[PDB]
């Protein structure tokens, strides 16, 4: 029943990992919701929100798997946030 | 030139479609550009038939 509950969460997470709530001057656009935090990404609750936020101020202008005691996904997020800024910061200089 | 090398690449798909070769559009541009390097095509006939062979052992 640990192979099963890994087959569900592997499929019940593809929609989430293909898109933090948005709104409609820029600190009220996207804001963290505190309840719905996985409590194993709580360490990086600020780099996720900061990673996509930089992608939108440029867009409107013009794989992850869960493992225990292994942080292959915690490292995978830092490898994209370290690029999310290098495209926007360079976009303003 | 990229307009010409697109047409010449588009015609070449059909003669590979009626000859019943399994090469789709992506693997064709890979093999065309690789043959464009200068590799001998008599060998490429063996790697594709073997890559497709070891691929079947998985399924």
């Amino acid at each position: 029943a640990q192979e099963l509950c890994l087959y569900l969460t592997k499929a019940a997470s593809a929609p989430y990992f293909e898109v933090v709530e948005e709104h409609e001057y820029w600190d009220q656009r996207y804001t963290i919701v505190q309840q719905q935090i996985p409590s194993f990404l709580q360490k990086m609750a600020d780099k996720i929100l900061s990673t996509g936020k930089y992608l939108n101020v440029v867009r409107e202008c013009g794989e992850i798997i869960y493992t225990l005691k292994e942080r292959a996904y915690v490292e995978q997020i830092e490898k994209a946030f370290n690029y999310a800024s290098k495209v926007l910061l360079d976009f303003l200089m | 030139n990229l307009n010409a090398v697109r047409e010449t690449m588009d015609v070449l798909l059909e003669i590979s479609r009626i000859l019943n070769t399994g090469l789709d559009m992506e693997t064709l541009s890979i093999c065309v550009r690789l043959c464009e390097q200068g590799i001998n095509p008599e060998a490429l006939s063996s790697v594709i038939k073997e890559l497709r062979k070891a691929t079947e052992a998985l399924k």
Partner: protein, 354 residues
């Protein structure tokens, strides 16, 4: 896993057979105080307090004591493996003395206790990486045009040119200094970077010189401490030395040397002309393939079909060729085993690694 170790005059590349790229690359240097021995990047980083040695300065091993240290470093520091637990494929320069081949073999089996090993010519591995067994191939840091037929290098037709990346770096320092800047100190590292990033081979030297003399269209900026400098005709004048060594006071260019073909049997020359492969860091200059095509065409018969192959991954094609070879089913029977070494001794390398 089998290991693949490419011994370079300037940089060594090491990794595991089967991989698409080397796991580590480091300077072929060993340093001792002016921790007793420093190897690789560390030796370079702390060169200020060390006396550096280059045991394979021009592709051929000249000091086996330090070469042994480079190999020790490769296994234990870079790859973090025990050599006695993995077969090892090593690379060697073209025209490597027979005695050196035996020495390398003896060191692997007796000093590192490798379970198996093999040695292949660098140029041959690069040709393999391009999917060929016949053709003419290598410009690195400290030093070849190597005709290969059916997997075998033809020693009688191999030519060595003591002109490579190192000479080009120093030449760039010289002409940038003549421009009004000043690059003279071991600044050499900075210029090496400028060279690798902004240089290119002009299709026509004179026309390019005329363009640079009458406009700023070929100028590029490079930032150092913040100072931004300008590199003009130096961009292409630097690598031009490969085609005209006289710029360096040397008496043939790479196109003319690629003479090697003419030294081969007339029956295979067309195969070489149609399969001239570039390899090595110094062949990375943008525009070099088209320039070679033009120059060779001028030297060869008008009826000859000329083709220059410049793989995007040619900087590491030697290592990649080794990864491919060591992974081949038919190559497994070719390794020299510890058993075979115990049976025949170091000289077995001549028969096993022909």
């Amino acid at each position: 896993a089998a290991l693949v170790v490419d011994n370079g005059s300037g940089m060594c590349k090491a990794g595991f057979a089967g991989d698409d790229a080397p796991r580590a690359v480091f300077p072929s240097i060993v340093g001792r105080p002016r921790k007793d021995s420093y190897v690789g990047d560390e030796a370079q980083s702390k060169r200020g307090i060390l006396t550096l040695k280059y045991p394979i300065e021009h592709g051929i091993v000249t000091n086996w004591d330090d070469m042994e240290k480079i190999w020790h470093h490769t296994f234990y520091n870079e790859l973090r493996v025990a050599p006695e637990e993995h077969p090892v494929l090593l690379t060697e320069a073209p025209l490597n003395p027979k005695a050196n081949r035996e020495k390398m073999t003896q060191i692997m089996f007796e000093t590192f206790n490798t379970p198996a090993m093999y040695v292949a010519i660098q140029a041959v591995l690069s040709l393999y990486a391009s999917g060929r067994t016949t053709g003419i191939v290598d410009s690195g840091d400290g030093v070849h045009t190597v005709p290969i037929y059916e997997g075998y290098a033809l020693p009688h037709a191999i030519l060595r040119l003591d002109l490579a990346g190192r000479d080009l770096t120093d030449y760039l320092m010289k002409i940038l200094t003549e421009r009004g800047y000043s690059f003279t100190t071991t600044e050499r590292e900075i210029v090496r970077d400028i060279k690798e990033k902004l240089c290119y081979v002009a299709l026509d030297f004179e026309q390019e010189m005329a363009t640079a003399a009458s406009s700023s269209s070929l100028e590029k900026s490079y930032e150092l401490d913040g100072q931004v400098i300008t590199i003009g005709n130096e961009r292409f004048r630097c690598p031009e030395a490969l085609f005209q060594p006289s710029f360096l006071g040397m008496e043939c260019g790479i196109h003319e040397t690629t003479n090697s073909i003419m030294k081969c049997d007339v029956d295979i020359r067309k195969d070489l002309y149609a399969n001239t492969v570039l390899s090595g860091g110094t062949t990375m200059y943008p525009g070099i393939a088209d320039r070679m095509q033009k120059e060779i065409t001028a030297l060869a018969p008008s009826t000859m079909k000329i083709k220059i192959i410049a793989p995007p991954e040619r900087k590491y094609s030697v290592w990649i060729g080794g990864s491919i070879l060591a992974s081949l089913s038919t190559f497994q029977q070719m390794w020299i085993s510890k058993q075979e070494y115990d049976e025949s001794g170091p000289s077995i390398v001549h028969r096993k690694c022909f």
